[PDB]
Symmetry: none
Subunit: 72 residues, 2 copies
DNA sequence: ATATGTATACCCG
DNA sequence: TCGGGTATACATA
């Protein structure tokens, strides 16, 4: 069975992504994997680099369709 | 009073995020405002699939809460 | 159940 | 009591 995950926004900043054409269906799972891969409980850190690279695969589904988007 | 935004996934990386310590509330919306503002060219990262062991050589991206984005 | 989603009762802290 | 979160009932396509 699938798991319905809900972030009760209306305050944070969710409406925008969906306001354009993508709530979190593919967003969440995408961001999660990145937050998952990196997952390293910590704090006090700055940034200054880009994040590219691709590695898509056809077998599951990944139905993330919106603003002319597609898998990596 | 708050907007329920939910992605009916399960293991689409979603579960991992909350599985570590954050039911995407701040992550999604954080990610949202970013993909919301940028709304063009997402940001990913993949060096090594965790593996328990880490290293951390420099700075790349910040997350807060209890996850962060280190290099490894 | 159709998935994805909202709405709401219950749920986890 | 709910912060939010998810599940299920229900809503929609």
């Amino acid at each position: 069975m699938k798991q319905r995950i809900t972030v009760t926004v209306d305050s944070d900043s969710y409406q925008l992504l969906k306001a354009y054409d993508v709530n979190i269906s593919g967003l969440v799972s995408t961001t999660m994997q990145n937050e998952a891969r990196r997952l390293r409980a910590e704090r006090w850190k700055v940034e200054n680099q880009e994040g590219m690279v691709e590695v898509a695969r056809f077998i599951e589904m990944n139905g993330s369709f919106a603003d002319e988007n597609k898998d990596w």
